Design an enzyme around this catalytic site. Sequence first.
Site, mmCIF file in Angstrom:
data_model
loop_
_atom_site.group_PDB
_atom_site.id
_atom_site.type_symbol
_atom_site.label_atom_id
_atom_site.label_comp_id
_atom_site.label_asym_id
_atom_site.label_seq_id
_atom_site.Cartn_x
_atom_site.Cartn_y
_atom_site.Cartn_z
ATOM 1 C CG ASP A 55 -8.764 28.235 13.687
ATOM 2 O OD1 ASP A 55 -9.441 28.648 14.421
ATOM 3 O OD2 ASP A 55 -8.349 28.864 12.763
ATOM 4 C CE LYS A 90 -14.645 32.382 7.787
ATOM 5 N NZ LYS A 90 -14.927 32.889 9.114
ATOM 6 C CG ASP A 111 -4.410 35.483 19.703
ATOM 7 O OD1 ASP A 111 -5.542 35.910 19.674
ATOM 8 O OD2 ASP A 111 -4.100 34.406 18.916
ATOM 9 C CG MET A 163 1.032 28.878 11.461
ATOM 10 S SD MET A 163 -0.061 30.050 12.428
ATOM 11 C CE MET A 163 -1.448 28.843 12.820
ATOM 12 C CG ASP A 175 -14.647 28.305 14.148
ATOM 13 O OD1 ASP A 175 -13.966 27.948 13.250
ATOM 14 O OD2 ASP A 175 -14.597 29.629 14.498
ATOM 15 C CG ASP A 212 -16.521 30.765 10.650
ATOM 16 O OD1 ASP A 212 -16.268 29.457 10.914
ATOM 17 O OD2 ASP A 212 -15.830 31.516 11.122
ATOM 18 C CD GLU A 265 -11.086 27.227 9.794
ATOM 19 O OE1 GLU A 265 -9.905 27.712 10.170
ATOM 20 O OE2 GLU A 265 -12.221 27.488 10.235
ATOM 21 C CG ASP A 313 -6.336 26.512 10.356
ATOM 22 O OD1 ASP A 313 -5.397 26.121 10.773
ATOM 23 O OD2 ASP A 313 -6.645 27.581 10.260
ATOM 24 C CG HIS A 326 -4.387 35.848 15.480
ATOM 25 N ND1 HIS A 326 -4.960 34.791 16.210
ATOM 26 C CD2 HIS A 326 -4.649 35.911 14.270
ATOM 27 C CE1 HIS A 326 -5.703 34.414 15.392
ATOM 28 N NE2 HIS A 326 -5.598 34.737 14.333
ATOM 29 C CG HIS A 359 -12.390 28.870 6.230
ATOM 30 N ND1 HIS A 359 -11.084 29.710 6.355
ATOM 31 C CD2 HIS A 359 -12.866 29.055 7.519
ATOM 32 C CE1 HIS A 359 -10.998 30.137 7.492
ATOM 33 N NE2 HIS A 359 -11.959 29.919 8.400
ATOM 34 C CD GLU A 417 -7.280 30.067 7.729
ATOM 35 O OE1 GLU A 417 -6.099 30.285 8.531
ATOM 36 O OE2 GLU A 417 -8.056 29.471 8.249
HETATM 37 O O1 LIG Z 1 -11.163 32.720 11.103
HETATM 38 C C1 LIG Z 1 -9.775 32.740 11.223
HETATM 39 C C2 LIG Z 1 -9.236 31.714 10.395
HETATM 40 O O2 LIG Z 1 -10.117 30.349 10.566
HETATM 41 C C3 LIG Z 1 -7.821 31.308 10.486
HETATM 42 O O3 LIG Z 1 -7.084 32.308 10.217
HETATM 43 C C4 LIG Z 1 -7.425 31.607 12.156
HETATM 44 O O4 LIG Z 1 -8.717 31.901 12.601
HETATM 45 C C5 LIG Z 1 -6.288 32.730 12.021
HETATM 46 O O5 LIG Z 1 -6.272 33.999 11.724
HETATM 47 MN MN LIG Z 2 -8.530 28.857 10.360
HETATM 48 MN MN LIG Z 3 -12.336 32.123 10.172
#
Ligand SMILES: OC[C@@H](O)[C@H](O)[C@@H](O)CO
Ligand SMILES: [Mn+2]
Ligand SMILES: [Mn+2]
Lengths: 385, 385, 385, 385
Positions: free
Chosen positions: C285, C181, C55, C86, C255, C253, C215, C243, C52, C218, C179
């Site tokens: 991710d 979610k 970051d 990306m 991860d 979430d 993702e 992702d 990002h 997600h 993306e």
């Molecule tokens: O939770 C965020 C999403 O999983 C993705 O976008 C990355 O984290 C980038 O923003």
């Molecule tokens: Mn992501």
């Molecule tokens: Mn996310």
Amino acid sequence: YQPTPEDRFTFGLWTVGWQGRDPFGDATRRALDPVESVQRLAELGAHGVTFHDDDLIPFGSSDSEREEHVKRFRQALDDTGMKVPMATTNLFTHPVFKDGGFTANDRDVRRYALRKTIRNIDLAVELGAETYVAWGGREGAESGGAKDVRDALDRMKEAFDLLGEYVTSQGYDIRFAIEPKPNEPRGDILLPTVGHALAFIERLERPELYGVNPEVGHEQMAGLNFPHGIAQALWAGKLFHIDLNGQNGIKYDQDLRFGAGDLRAAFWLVDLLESAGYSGPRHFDFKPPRTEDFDGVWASAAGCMRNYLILKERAAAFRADPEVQEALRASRLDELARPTAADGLQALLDDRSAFEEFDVDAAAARGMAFERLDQLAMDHLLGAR
Amino acid sequence: YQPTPEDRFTFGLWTVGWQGRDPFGDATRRALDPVESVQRLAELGAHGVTFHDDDLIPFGSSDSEREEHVKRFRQALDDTGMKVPMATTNLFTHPVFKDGGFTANDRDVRRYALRKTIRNIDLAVELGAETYVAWGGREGAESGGAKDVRDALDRMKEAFDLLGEYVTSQGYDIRFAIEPKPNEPRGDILLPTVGHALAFIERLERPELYGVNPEVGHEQMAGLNFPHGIAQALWAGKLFHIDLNGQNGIKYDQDLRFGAGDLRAAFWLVDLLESAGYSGPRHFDFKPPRTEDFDGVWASAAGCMRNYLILKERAAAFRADPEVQEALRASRLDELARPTAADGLQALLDDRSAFEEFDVDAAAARGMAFERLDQLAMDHLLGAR
Amino acid sequence: YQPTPEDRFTFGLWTVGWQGRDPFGDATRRALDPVESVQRLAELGAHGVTFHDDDLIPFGSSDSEREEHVKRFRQALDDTGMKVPMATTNLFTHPVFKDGGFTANDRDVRRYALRKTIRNIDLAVELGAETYVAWGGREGAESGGAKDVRDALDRMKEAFDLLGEYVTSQGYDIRFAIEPKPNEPRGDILLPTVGHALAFIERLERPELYGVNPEVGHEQMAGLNFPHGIAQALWAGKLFHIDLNGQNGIKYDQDLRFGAGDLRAAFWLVDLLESAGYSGPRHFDFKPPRTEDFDGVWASAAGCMRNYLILKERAAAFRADPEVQEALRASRLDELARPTAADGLQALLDDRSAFEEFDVDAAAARGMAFERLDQLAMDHLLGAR
Amino acid sequence: YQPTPEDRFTFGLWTVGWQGRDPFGDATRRALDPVESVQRLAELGAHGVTFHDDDLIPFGSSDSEREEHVKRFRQALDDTGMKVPMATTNLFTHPVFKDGGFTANDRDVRRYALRKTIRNIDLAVELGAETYVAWGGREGAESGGAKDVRDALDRMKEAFDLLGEYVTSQGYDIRFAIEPKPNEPRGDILLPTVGHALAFIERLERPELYGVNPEVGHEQMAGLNFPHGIAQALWAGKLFHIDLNGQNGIKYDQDLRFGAGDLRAAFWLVDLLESAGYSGPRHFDFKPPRTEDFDGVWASAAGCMRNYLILKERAAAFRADPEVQEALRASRLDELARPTAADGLQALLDDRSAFEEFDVDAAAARGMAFERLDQLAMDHLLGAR
Ligand SMILES: OC[C@@H](O)[C@H](O)[C@@H](O)CO
Ligand SMILES: [Mn+2]
Ligand SMILES: [Mn+2]
Ligand SMILES: OC[C@@H](O)[C@H](O)[C@@H](O)CO
Ligand SMILES: OC[C@@H](O)[C@H](O)[C@@H](O)CO
Ligand SMILES: OC[C@@H](O)[C@H](O)[C@@H](O)CO
Ligand SMILES: [Mn+2]
Ligand SMILES: [Mn+2]
Ligand SMILES: [Mn+2]
Ligand SMILES: [Mn+2]
Ligand SMILES: [Mn+2]
Ligand SMILES: [Mn+2]
């Protein structure tokens, strides 16, 4: 990975016998004769079979017809050497049970449900069953006003106390295992999880007679960690029986073969049962998908035992690996086994190193090394060592 | 629907004091001084406030600074007449607790967690708290190998037994209420539901000292029926405290104001608490959304008490309605209160009307009339009578 | 199973760089310098890194400080041969975005969101990014009245159309990947799934510029089947990026590193990407759990790549097995590929074997043989063949 | 709150006609004659009825018996003025569809599925249906290898394109509405959500002929926000029909009467349909619980319509309240409707107030006032204003 009777793999008559009728569809398979199931299961290496009353004796049978059904089944057991370690009552299928068996609002239905249960307990004992399972599938509600839950728990306790009084007055060597489920076929079911059932048992007149029969897919329908729940049951000394199957998360009750659904949870489950030395039946309460013919039925059943055996080998290898032993010390699993304060309360209160002089920042900087451990567990599961 | 102190509405300092920092975002509000919160809450009609040690006294404070913080707070209590019915320890925020407080793998952290708890118990009693809450938010795991759960339960029992020994040896009039949560911030949390916590308590040395502090949103995160769970706690005599908020199903812990989320479950909950005559605090453990400024914070807080009061009025009206009384008899809720077999086991076994001569088809044909009852409950909730 | 640059594994700076702040806890790790991450990732055999804007360039840096940060980063890429395939915008962390970026109710915030994004597009292009990701993590609501969703979709379309106009007017070779979610950090997020995002893209002015960045975790937060959703994206020609991580169910979430969570779904996802010949980045991710120190951080990252590589091998062996090929024919996977009616509508209507003379009972009796096929996939996954 | 024909309430024959067979239980009610349903529904003030072919004409009826069934039905419609606004095909009940209709792996089954559908389209047109619903309830899989999803989407597109060609070649005025569902009775169903269905439609040969038929409980089985998904469908111009019922969470498909389940979502859905001016049928696809006799069946049906009517009144009062209008301005709902940059890209890029001189801290400090707005909606819903 050939199963043999020593592996204690059991199957319900209603499992391989499921005809494939679901909420949206007609049966896709003919009914299986119980004696055919017994013989086929013996051939696959099963230890034994279990049954609801209504699997073995069709609802409504005269005493004459009842006796014929039991005789044919018993002959097939005698011929194969198959055991019947567990039995249970069907208190959910017949429309009379639409609002419950033991906690039906109608008193006459509750007395009926008890009498139907008592009758099958006599049969179970005579066949050699050690465990009598109760799954109250219809105990619950779709709407909040329909059931006063404190009254329902009074009625549930009353029924189980009466069952315990029966068993003890007959001199039977049988224990009860209560099976929790969060929902389905009722919107919410009473004693929804392993925890609820454990807590309930402690309020019965004779708690020593009752344990739990947890099912993989039941607990996973509440998104709960099934191995954590089993560990609690074992910790309490109440794991009397277990039902093994597969479930892909929070949705309807899928009853996939064991190993399908959450594969990693299956691995941790087998690790735990084998290392705790659980010595009861490994019972598969599952349904071959209605897509399958009879060849697929027996392949699905074989698959349940096969996955258990692969998982057992992987878990045993994981624990035997000194690199895993090293990883466990690095994550301080050994220190978890040590008492926090065997020195006692007063010593703890006076111990300046526990608080006044505890370095919080040094302890907070210690890595748990859990990711490395978990990757070793992954490598073993996958046989990528 | 004006709240007054007689309604027993309480709030945590960390609730209206939440700065809006979430996993993806920085704080959106300045920190609130505890004394300002006390005064504002008194103005809104609250009965009292609750606190973690770390809400009231910033982590690491010298004894000098600690004493100043308690003095200012106590002055604000003296000035307003606000009560402190409950307190709890923060065993989750500081990095030292990253693997738990009472069930940390590191022994030194476990002793530290006990000492930190004991210290705040002394403070809680001195302020008049009747209930000491324990939410083990960090007790659990993300991975299966990281925690031997039987050992962890040994350590959890050890910690609570030591707490009970402390309290009894001091002569304190305080009870413990264990707060279950299924997950978040750990992947799975130990004692995930009300049932698990109830079962665990029965294995402590002095079970009479421990109850549960269930939270609406915690149980709903496992998709469980919150009123059913409360009914079980009440049935066991263990509902020592309750945390009220809102949750829209199975997802992250939302902490919406009470009344938001599952509105019908809120209605059944209030119905149950009021009719069981629960007499403890109605504590709101919620977070004003981070979209809100301070005006929105106090509106959200007012909203919690307001919805409780509207729901209480609707539930009272529902039970008072003779048409509802008639509907309840029609669905046989009255027969649920009757013993199944006060005549005893032998009489039941000999009763031909219970089995041999039971008409299953006539009993199966009886409608439960639950939909009409539920529509009466809907009409009342909506004030469409 | 050693990763090399040709495997196309990439990592966000924010992944290995996560300090371990969650909703209930402070950071457990010190901040990583972006240049250290680049170097450490290159050493593990990663192909590239993503970021990002926030970051890389701390929020609110002067143009002078901004330049120094990019300079240091560009030098570390120069020294290592690390790619930047990306990049994306942080429109979620700063309190100004508490109600969204592109769909904030305040128009001035929406303009600012667009300008912040456009600035980072220029930078991303300069660095060599082929994909620009957009995750609208703040677009949504906790309450039904807060967001008119038709208006919000107008504002979302407007923003993406403006971004399209910008990129085409600059002659940039960069595509957008939306993306989706379902929730977290908002109660419900707009475009909650891969499906909603695909449908939305078809209404943009230049649909060819936009695809999806799904993702694993997600889609799994909605209990959806991730490989099925990826198949739909591929079918539509819209899988621009992906992702990869792990998720244990419908909950917050998590991860987890890729391969943890739903292991079987990870197998079927790798099978699909590899057989469809996806050639984009394999982006992880994920967040190393906050229990871990820096060693655990790099163990977790390496584990992502290792699990992908093991699954790739097992999926390849699965597809290459003649016995699996036989099982695929037995299950009529090959017939699924034949058109249903390449003979045309008129021919189908006149075909008596299609309806009038179709033997439904003979076709209904055919077993699908899906269980045997699935046990072969299981045997391959576990290396038990 | 009395329903009249102009309210456009419709019911499937299969809804009030459900005999109460679930996965664990036999039927609790006798079959309803379609002509009795029509008459009873007309008496309750319903606008019309809908049907699957198999609800009206028992499966495998001769052309002669088929005619007699339609004749009796048509006469009951003639006698009552009841409309038939929608019809659909049963491609899920008969064992032949155990692997799907349009996407069965067996090509002969797929042809038969198309012919069975086409036959009922002719009938539906003759009866006056404006919408033809398709719910692909068997399209999907329990296991990852059983269904190549890209091929399955080709077969699904092929079938819908053939249906499009058929309807346009006949000159019929009938549109298709695709009904998405995440799971049950398959492990995962293809096109699981409103989003996936919208996206799929855009790839059909004549997209203008196809819209969606979303169901409350289907989207809620994925924990999605139903009013948000309906807003997306409206935004796209694709809400051709809607199924209304109730659902309590992510669990099995409950089919409660509309208004039960998530009450607040039902309020926000009615608000949206009424303010967008949806003018299609308000179709109730629900099942009276199997606890109910016939009186309970009609109580439940009437309850669907009553709850819609109460919510309609409360939503109207909500929107009409000047104080709510003030709260909507305070929350900047009106600003959400203004274009972000009607001044254009070049003007936005040159606007210094949009970035360079934008005061982020002043905009970040503005409260959204969402909590006060939501409590007003709550007060209206409960009639507490
Ligand atoms: O939770 C965020 C999403 O999983 C993705 O976008 C990355 O984290 C980038 O923003
Ligand atoms: Mn992501
Ligand atoms: Mn996310
Ligand atoms: O969901 C059903 C329960 O799993 C099973 O024990 C058998 O059905 C037992 O009666
Ligand atoms: O999820 C958090 C728990 O609800 C609460 O009791 C407070 O956080 C108590 O420590
Ligand atoms: O479960 C079925 C779906 O909800 C709708 O299609 C109707 O039932 C029509 O098939
Ligand atoms: Mn079971
Ligand atoms: Mn089962
Ligand atoms: Mn709480
Ligand atoms: Mn809380
Ligand atoms: Mn359905
Ligand atoms: Mn429907």
